[PDB]
Amino acid sequence: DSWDKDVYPEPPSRTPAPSPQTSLPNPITYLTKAYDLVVDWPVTLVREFIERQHAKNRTYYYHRQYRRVPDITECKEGDVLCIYEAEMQWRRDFKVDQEIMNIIQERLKACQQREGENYQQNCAKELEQFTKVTKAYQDRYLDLGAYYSARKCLAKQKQRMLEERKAARQ
Amino acid sequence: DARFLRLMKFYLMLTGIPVIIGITLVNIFIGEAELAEIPEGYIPEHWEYYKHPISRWIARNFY
Amino acid sequence: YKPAPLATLPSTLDPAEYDVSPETRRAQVERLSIRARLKREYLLQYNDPKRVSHIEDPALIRWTYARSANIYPNFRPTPKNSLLGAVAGFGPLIFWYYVFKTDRDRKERLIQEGKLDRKFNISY
Amino acid sequence: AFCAPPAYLTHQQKVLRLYKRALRHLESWCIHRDKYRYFACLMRARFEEHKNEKDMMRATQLLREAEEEFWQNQHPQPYIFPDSPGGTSFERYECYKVPEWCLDYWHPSEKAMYPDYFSKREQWKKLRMESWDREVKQLQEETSPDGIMTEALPPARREGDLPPLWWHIVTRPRER
Amino acid sequence: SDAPPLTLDGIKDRVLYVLKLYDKIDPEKLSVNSHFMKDLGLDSLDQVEIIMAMEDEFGFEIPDIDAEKLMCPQEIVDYIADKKDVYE
Amino acid sequence: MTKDMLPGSYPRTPEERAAAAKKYNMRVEDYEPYPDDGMGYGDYPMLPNRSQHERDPWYQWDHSELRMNWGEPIHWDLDMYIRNRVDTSPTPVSWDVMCKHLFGFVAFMVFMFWVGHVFPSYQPVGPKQYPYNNLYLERGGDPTKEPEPVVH
Amino acid sequence: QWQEDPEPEDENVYAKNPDFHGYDSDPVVDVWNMRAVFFFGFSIVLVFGTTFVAYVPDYRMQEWARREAERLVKYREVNGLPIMESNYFDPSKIQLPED
Amino acid sequence: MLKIILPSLMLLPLTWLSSPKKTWTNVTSYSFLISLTSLTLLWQTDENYKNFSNMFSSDPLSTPLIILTAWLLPLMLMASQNHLKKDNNVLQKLYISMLISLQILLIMTFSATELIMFYILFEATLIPTLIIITRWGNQTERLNAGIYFLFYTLIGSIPLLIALILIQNHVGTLNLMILSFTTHTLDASWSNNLLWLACMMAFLIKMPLYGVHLWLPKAHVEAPIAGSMILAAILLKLGSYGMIRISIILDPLTKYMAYPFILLSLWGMIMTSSICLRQTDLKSLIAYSSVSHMALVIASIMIQTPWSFMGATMLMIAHGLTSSLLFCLANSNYERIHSRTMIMARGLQMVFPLMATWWLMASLANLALPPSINLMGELFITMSLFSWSNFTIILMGINIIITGMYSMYMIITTQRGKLTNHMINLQPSHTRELTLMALHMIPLILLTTSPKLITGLTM
Amino acid sequence: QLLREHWVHILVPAGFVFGCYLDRKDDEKLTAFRNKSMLFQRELRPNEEVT
Amino acid sequence: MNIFTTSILLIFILLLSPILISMSNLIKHINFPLYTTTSIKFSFIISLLPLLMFFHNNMEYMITTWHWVTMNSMELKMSFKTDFFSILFTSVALFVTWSIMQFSSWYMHSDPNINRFIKYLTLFLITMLILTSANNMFQLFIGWEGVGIMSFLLIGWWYGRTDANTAALQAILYNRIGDIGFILAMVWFSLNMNSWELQQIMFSNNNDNLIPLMGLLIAATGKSAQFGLHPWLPSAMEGPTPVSALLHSSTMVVAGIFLLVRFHPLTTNNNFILTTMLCLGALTTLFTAICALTQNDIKKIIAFSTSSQLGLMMVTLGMNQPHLAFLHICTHAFFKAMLFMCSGSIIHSLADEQDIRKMGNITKIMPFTSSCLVIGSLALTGMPFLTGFYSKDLIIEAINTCNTNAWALLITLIATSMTAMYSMRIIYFVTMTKPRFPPLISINENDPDLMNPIKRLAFGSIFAGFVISYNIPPTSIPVLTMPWFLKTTALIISVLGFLIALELNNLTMKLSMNKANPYSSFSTLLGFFPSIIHRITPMKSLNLSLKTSLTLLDLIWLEKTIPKSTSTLHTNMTTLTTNQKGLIKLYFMSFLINIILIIILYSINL
């Protein structure tokens, strides 16, 4: 996994430092040491064997880059050709505008789980990053129905700017 | 009721075992391709974008 | 004690069951003959050989037909029924009509300020 | 279960029935047994006194207010046995008692097992089909032209004959 | 798991067993076909006293209209058995 | 099934009443239909509102589980009055009083809480005293804005 | 009387072909049809149909979403841009009316 | 979207061109194979929809339906074999050669690029239906359904027609994915107000309301089963493919104007669901339960939110299977007893010990069950409504409670209790019918796993 | 052989073929904007067509 | 980061083995209960290792295992939560269930279908651990209602006895209400926080989350049957006794009350529902306890006793001391699932008799159950160290020490005296009070399929609370100051509840007929809650469905308004169409009208 998932230094791990009287064997390491030879040692060999067959018949794929294909403000009314491209250009970003929001969600939960009862003042960095997102999201895509087409988003963005230059008049 | 389940359980195995066994073997040997970046202009062959092997085989013969 | 339509009273009370008079007594005899002739038919027809199908049970049918496809011809337009169907038909239909409307139209006046802060909502 | 209750044709069983239930609504008050055993003999006297009166008015006008007081003395949770109406296991073992006609759908590989139990079955059902018209004819010619008909509860006359309606009660499933 | 079934003999040797505890009738001279009202000196009320022991002996409380009929102690062995499906 | 074996419409002409109860296989006097006021209750009976519990649960019927024979015609609302939904079984306590102790219990019950909420059974001490001001940092605050004034 | 044939009473067809499956009375049409019911339908159409319940990738372009999305952040987040800027259609190349 | 239909044409001769004791077998087998050919269109790698022809088309909304219909056909074709066990070979063919047409016509609709071709097949679905219920019904009242089912479906259809006419006069083309783009903002005129009726109304006859729904019970009660499946499965819940497409042109008015049809549902959605307690006719019982659910779908489209549409597509298809299922469950008894009665065969599970486990898996799916889709549809429809209004739950909750009664109550009065000992005519199970309930559920069990498929335009 | 009591089995798949041809005759009927779309607009190697 | 994940999934694979082998044409060869029960034995063995991991490190992982669906900024993923809540209950609800199948082979043999029975427990036993383990608020909801549905099907087991079908359905009636305020919540969070899973949901600490939070009470009151929905549970004792043990004391009544502890940091920041935790939760501690006294059916008496104990858990949430509750969740299973487990040993030994009036020397005839029943009921109330102290103490320390309310303390304390006053009853009329039971002695005992599990609950009910008291991470800071008559309250008060019940059930020995006051008849039945509601609502809320919605509206009005009013409109206009005698002296005088009209029509237009 890439280094964009805030994997903050993975162990701040503690150390084994016993202090009982007439010290006992701990069932964790008395058993997990009995675990990394019996089911990890097989399964580590198997995938170690799966890998070498994959590089025999190795196969590649790619990402399918895309283009700008001008958006709607350059585009003509009625002319279905242009708009259709720009339209399926926008719904083509409506996902990528929204799979991001899946990542922050995905990132906004794992924070406090790797912080437990700290939970705040160590996830504000991630939480401030969230309101920052959600505010543009709603300001992009809130009032819309399910027939969301770029002519509506474009109007939503255009009703808004009027107040942005109507409230700058007093 | 028993005859039935004995038949339901069978004719699904009749094609489930050729598949499930067969589909374990493909992933074992091969499959699960990897990312890659375009060679500065290559015109990928329409299934150089999808991962799973059989899935980028169906896409060759069809679609 | 005080009987009610629900939780009616036992039969040891309610002073029937006591007046064994030949005008009251004959009833409990003749129902019972009416009843035995009938059950004896079902007995005579339950364990009849060659009965292969089920048994008709027509009275059960007279109740359904009476309830489903034998109502509307037995209609009479009346008050207590024309007034009652509107208040069952349109009444609740018109009660909520002010609720959801004012729920919205009070929700709408707030949204046009920001006094009703749109929190992290995306459902539309 | 096996009889029919007609009109409660007289004061007697109405009282024996009242004594029956009313008695059962004492042990739930008298949990302990020695305590129970006492109060019954007193209530026994509450009937053994005014045993025979013949005043049908007062017989009813004792037997009527007998419940205008007992109702306000009975126990709310009486002791009914298992298998008793309203009680636990009144119908527990009824999810298994299949009606025995359905047995005649098993085919071989299910009744190829034990060729004897069905060797019985056919010599039972031979008795049935061969005893029907004789059986019904009795009910036909039974002197029931008019009037009283309780159930007529008819037996088999002393013949080489089988009684009236019997597949109901006999061949019914067991209990457990 | 337990509760072994009877054999109409652990009934008959157990019904008559009960009737000998009654102390108002049955001075160890009764029998199995011995009616109550006519040849033992009981009342009808004295009969309801009998069936309750049998009810208290098994736990299947007899309906209203079956104690009315059961007079002979054989008849008590004769109704207990037809119900509980004895003689397998 | 026959046309004039199925129901009809409000049998006027009291000679006709015999052709309702003997149609439905019933004693004539006992058969008095609905008052006819409005709804399509036709020539069907009334049949007093017995829940099917008070029926003597012994005595195998032609229709087990349901407390009816092959005839003895059916209560109109025999959906509620089976032994699956309702029971009008006579109760050892009477409705008006039985409905009173419950609502009489609760309305007395609720009133103590309000009485108790006035006089809470507190413990004669102060509140807690937290480490820092009110910690401002894990309770949830903004440690680029001001510090806070409160302190012990 | 009106002279139509009487009702045909019940048939009770588990007497010949106690292996009767449901299709036709004669023994050898059931077996060579049900086997057609199962195999043509019940085996392949579920199995080979469910072979696409896992396959048919990027169904409506979701698997492709993560790639561009994980790409779009690591380019936009590393350099100094704020993610999710404020909006679509920047105030350039948009001519609002006056007053 | 042609390689599907044209085989399904070739089935129609196949029945007339097959031998008597070989005809259900062949026609049954390939109809399954039609499903696979009716599945290739799932190759939706992109949001770029699959506009094959200048008349036929596809969507994530239709492709469930298109798949679904080709799946109902073998099924419904199978469930009507012991029914009509005795009849001419002609009827035994014609009942196929008429029934199939529903497959062919509906495919054309659900694939359609336009509203006419939808329209002139929105009523050509009618010939194969009315022909059935009026012909192979088993009741004296079979005919009045063929009248009610006929006219309500038309009396609304004609305004719907006239609006499609009008739209053409203003624009010219009257097709999809253009009106979506060349969409004008309406003036909210009274003349323009009547248009919102006419373009919604006929679909709201299909999806029945608290009002016009009298045609739905009379239909199902009298259809043998195949006038009940499709009439419940894809002939009903057909309006949505109509009502979602046509609703797109006229959104700027359908905020203020749609409160009644929304509201008239959310009462009837509770009433029909509460009627469905105290009923006798089983085959009627289910018919209301569909009207209960689909009343929520009418409370979906008029809100236009994505989870609301998703709340329908996870509900329509989730309902068509389980609805078409439950009729078979009843048809597993009416063919044995010959009475639509919820009480005559009550103490089952002694005799049909397994079929109970197809009732039981179904009724649970009738109500909202969590690892399922009848909930996911009934859930998202709640969520959108809570956004539309936070007091719908005071109305929704009254149903999901009631829905926990009648769905289970069907189990009680049909599989639990002392058996009606007096029914020797209980053939335990035909393997014909017993594998129907498989071919309903195993779709759900799989379709429940990955419902990325089943969603609508939005996801 | 005999009078071909079973030949209809050839009948339907001849349709699926014929459909896949008619579905394809549709394709070469449209055959416009073969590369003139703004999205792809990719000139190919030396070879000839795309669809 | 490997072992822990790898086991917590693996227990399901053990539990999915009985079911996934239940249809293989193999179950009819082997001893499927023992098979299952053997798997359960290894599941507990495996389950300790997570618990052994948590106490040492307190690590709280959040496994996912799967991606189900993508939905507009919500990746619907299965996912498992585990922190002090699905790490101990997951083992103890599993441990006890080992002591059910062994029983449920002995109890409920002579049954043609246990393999079908045992199937359904493991259906349940999976669903409850999901509810417990579920990260999401929807994955939880699988374990919300499947838990409920599967109880409808074991309560209603002998599928005659429609009275048992009812009392199953009665539950589902009130459970599908608990469905509602759950779904109110899971709708609200989405519509304010696009997650459905707990982690992001915690970030709404400041939103006045008032009504959704109240919806959870509906969810609580459904499964954890408080008072508005109490009566389904005792009526749902018509099912078999282990099911009453498994479900309705340890693995369903925990559900609603377990929900709140997983939402414990949100009931903290409100001060209103934080009350109605108490005022509703504590109502049940009093009412059901009073109801519980003058009952006679044991399985009811135990059932009622849960409902008070059920409330006292909520009373923990009556303040912000939730971790005490979960500790009481655990211990409440090692008692109740002994008594049923101990009661079926009493019952099935002899006949199906299961009311106390007909037995009184269980001490002598069964010195075993009369040794372990007491280990239940003694340890239950307040026995000073048997886990109904290490639970009950820390409860009563708080209730009389936090600023809560006044009446709630009394009704609790009066009721905490009252867990005795029916346990004294059970442990006297059953275990003393010289016997009364029919003569046939069929007591089978010493069956090692019976003792060996009954042993362990005793081992569990005695040791485990201590073992859990210290090994856990201490939170819920314990006020321990408590002058003489606060800390010493739960002890004396339970002793007090013996003596009165002793003298009360000793004065029933003397020959004297006692009076039927409303007290001990109000409480003999239920407080009249079922008797009065279960015959008005299905007589009003069901009769408000025929003559206003079917035979009024859907059938006899709506069938007039559109259809028949229209048909009549046309056919009435149809008779006047063509009911003229076919003359021409009329038609022409009819035509000539048209002639004038089209003149008088044209002569206006111009």
Interface of F with A in 121-150 (CB under 8 A): 137-138, 140-141, 143
Check CB contact under 8 Å for G14 and D108.
no
Q: What is the DSSP string of F24-88?
A: TT--TTT-------SS---S--------TTSS-S-S--SBTTTTB-SSSPPPTTTTTSSTTT---
List the domain boundaries for chain I.
1-51
Residues of D in contact with E59 (CB under 8 A): 81-83
Length of chain H: 459
Chains B and I form CB pairs within 8 A to the count of: 3
Answer for the pair D101, C52: CB distance below 8 angstroms, yes or no: no
* Tokens 């996934």 found at: J20
Name the residue facing H429 among B1, B7, B62 (closest C-beta).
Answer: B1
**Quick check: A128 contacting F, CB < 8 Å?**
no
Q: How far is CA D14 from CA D65, H207, J26, in A?
A: 14, 61, 59
**Quick check: H356 contacting J, CB < 8 Å?**
no
Q: What is the 3-state secondary structure (H, E, C) of chain H?
A: CCCCHHHHHHHHHHHHCCCHHHHHHHHHHHHHHHHHHCCHHHCCCCCCCCCCCCCECCCCCHHHHHHHHHHHHHHHHHCCCCCCCCCCCCHHHHHHHHHHHHHHHHHHHHCECECHHHHHHHCCCCHHHHHHHCCCCCCCCHHHHHHHHHHHHHHCHHHHHHHHHHHHHHCCCCECCCCCCCCCCCCCCHHHHHHHHHHHHHHHHHCCCCCCCCHHHHHHHHCCCHHHHHHHHCCCCCHHHHHCCHHHHHCCCCCCCCHHHHHHHHHHHHHHHHHCCCCCCHHHHHHHHHHHHHHHHHHHHCCCCHHHHHHHHHHHHHHHHHHHHHHHHHHHHHHHHCCCCCCCCCCCCCCCCCCHHHHHHHHHHHCCCCCCCHHHHHHHHHHHHHHHCCCCHHHHHHHHHHHHHHHHHHHHHHHCCCCCCCCCCCCCCCHHHHCHHHHHHHHHHHHCCCCCCCCCCCC
Residues of J in contact with E1 (CB under 8 A): 106, 109-110, 348, 444
- Annotated resolution, angstroms: 3.9
Chains that touch J (3 or more CB pairs under 8 A): A, B, C, D, E, F, H
Query: What is the rounded CA–CA span in Å between residue H25 and residue G34?
Result: 8
Q: Considering only CA atoms, which of A85, H44, B62, H54 is closest in space to residue I30?
A: H54
For H426, nearest residue in chain D (alpha carbons) = D102
Answer for the pair J133, J86: CB distance below 8 angstroms, yes or no: yes
* Tokens 């027609």 found at: H161
Q: How far is CA H36 from CA H29, H41, H67, H74, H238, in A?
A: 12, 9, 8, 12, 22
**Quick check: E63 contacting F, CB < 8 Å?**
yes
What DSSP character marks residue J236? Answer: T
| Experimental technique used to determine this entry | cryo-EM
Check CB contact under 8 Å for J403 and F39.
no
Residues of F in contact with C8 (CB under 8 A): 49, 54, 88, 90
Residues of H in contact with J152 (CB under 8 A): 408
Check CB contact under 8 Å for H6 and I8.
no
Name the residue facing G87 among A72, A96, A136 (closest C-beta).
Answer: A136
J136: β partners: J197
Residues of F in contact with A121 (CB under 8 A): 137-138, 140-141, 143
For J564, nearest residue in chain C (alpha carbons) = C72
Query: What is the rounded CA–CA span in Å between residue J422 and residue J407?
Result: 22
* Tokens 């993508």 found at: J70
Residue J576 buriedness (CB in 10 A; 0-12 / 13-18 / 19+): exposed
What DSSP character marks residue J156? Answer: S
H helices of chain G, in order, are 27-36, 44-54, 63-79
Chains that touch D (3 or more CB pairs under 8 A): C, E, F, G, H, J
Q: What is the DSSP string of J277-334?
A: HHHHHHHHHHHHHHHHHT--BHHHHHHHHHHHHHHHHHHHHTTT-HHHHHHHHHHTHH
- Residue A16 CB contacts under 8 Å (≥ 6 apart), including other chains: A29
Pair of tokens at residue H215:
């045609």
Query: What is the rounded CA–CA span in Å between residue H85 and residue G23?
Result: 9
- Domain carrying residue H92: 2-459
Q: How many Cβ atoms sit within 10 Å of the Cβ of residue E83?
A: 15
> How many domains in chain E?
1
For J193, nearest residue in chain A (alpha carbons) = A105
Residues of B in contact with J23 (CB under 8 A): 5, 9
Pair of tokens at residue G48:
């080979």
Q: Considering only CA atoms, which of H330, C17, J93 is closest in space to residue D15?
A: C17
Answer for the pair J494, J381: CB distance below 8 angstroms, yes or no: yes
SS3 category, J134: strand
Chain C meets chain J (3+ C-beta pairs below 8 A): yes
**Quick check: J112 contacting F, CB < 8 Å?**
no
Name the residue facing C123 among H141, H305, H420 (closest C-beta).
Answer: H305
Residues of H in contact with B4 (CB under 8 A): 354, 429, 431, 434-435
Name the residue facing J405 among F86, F88, F121 (closest C-beta).
Answer: F121
Query: What is the rounded CA–CA span in Å between residue F43 and residue F20?
Result: 7
Chains that touch I (3 or more CB pairs under 8 A): A, B, H
For E10, nearest residue in chain J (alpha carbons) = J440
- Residue F20 CB contacts under 8 Å (≥ 6 apart), including other chains: F8, F11, F26, F31, F33, F43
Answer for the pair H71, H35: CB distance below 8 angstroms, yes or no: yes
Query: What is the rounded CA–CA span in Å between residue D71 and residue G30?
Result: 67
Mutate to test the interface with I, among B43, B49, B62 (most CBs of I within 10 A): B43
Q: How many Cβ atoms sit within 10 Å of the Cβ of residue C22?
A: 7
- Residue J431 CB contacts under 8 Å (≥ 6 apart), including other chains: J361, J362, J363, J370, J373, J374
Q: Considering only CA atoms, which of E73, E70, E78, E76 is closest in space to residue E31?
A: E73
Q: What is the DSSP string of J439-475?
A: S--------HHHHHHHHHHHHHHHHHHHHHHHHSPP-
Residues of H in contact with D99 (CB under 8 A): 419, 421
Name the residue facing H387 among J173, J191, J558 (closest C-beta).
Answer: J191
Pair of tokens at residue D113:
């097992």
* Tokens 């859907």 found at: J554
**Quick check: G99 contacting A, CB < 8 Å?**
no
Check CB contact under 8 Å for H428 and D96.
no
Check CB contact under 8 Å for D1 and F92.
no
Answer for the pair J337, J100: CB distance below 8 angstroms, yes or no: yes
Pair of tokens at residue G66:
């993560």
**Looking at CA atoms only, how far is residue C29 from chain G in angstroms?**
38
> How many domains in chain H?
1
Ramachandran angles phi, psi of J355, nearest 5°? -125, 150
Check CB contact under 8 Å for B33 and A64.
no
Q: How far is CA J52 from CA A75, J15, J49, in A?
A: 65, 21, 5
What DSSP character marks residue A168? Answer: G
Check CB contact under 8 Å for G43 and B51.
no
| Cα H341 from chain centroid (whole Å) | 23
**Quick check: C52 contacting G, CB < 8 Å?**
yes
**Quick check: J504 contacting D, CB < 8 Å?**
no
Residue J197 buriedness (CB in 10 A; 0-12 / 13-18 / 19+): buried
Residues of C in contact with F36 (CB under 8 A): 76
Residues of G in contact with C52 (CB under 8 A): 9-10, 12
| CA end-to-end span of chain H | 23
For F92, nearest residue in chain D (alpha carbons) = D76
**Quick check: G93 contacting H, CB < 8 Å?**
no
Residues of E with catalytic roles = 43
Q: How far is CA C64 from CA C67, C71, H209, in A?
A: 5, 11, 25
Amino acid at J545: S
Check CB contact under 8 Å for H280 and F84.
no
**Quick check: E4 contacting F, CB < 8 Å?**
no
For B58, nearest residue in chain H (alpha carbons) = H43
Query: What is the rounded CA–CA span in Å between residue C44 and residue C29?
Result: 22
Pair of tokens at residue B14:
């009749």
Check CB contact under 8 Å for C49 and D128.
yes
Residues of G in contact with C53 (CB under 8 A): 9-10
Check CB contact under 8 Å for D88 and J110.
no
**Quick check: A133 contacting J, CB < 8 Å?**
no
- Establish how many alpha carbons lie within 13 A of residue F136's alpha carbon, considering only the half-sphere containing its beta carbon: 12
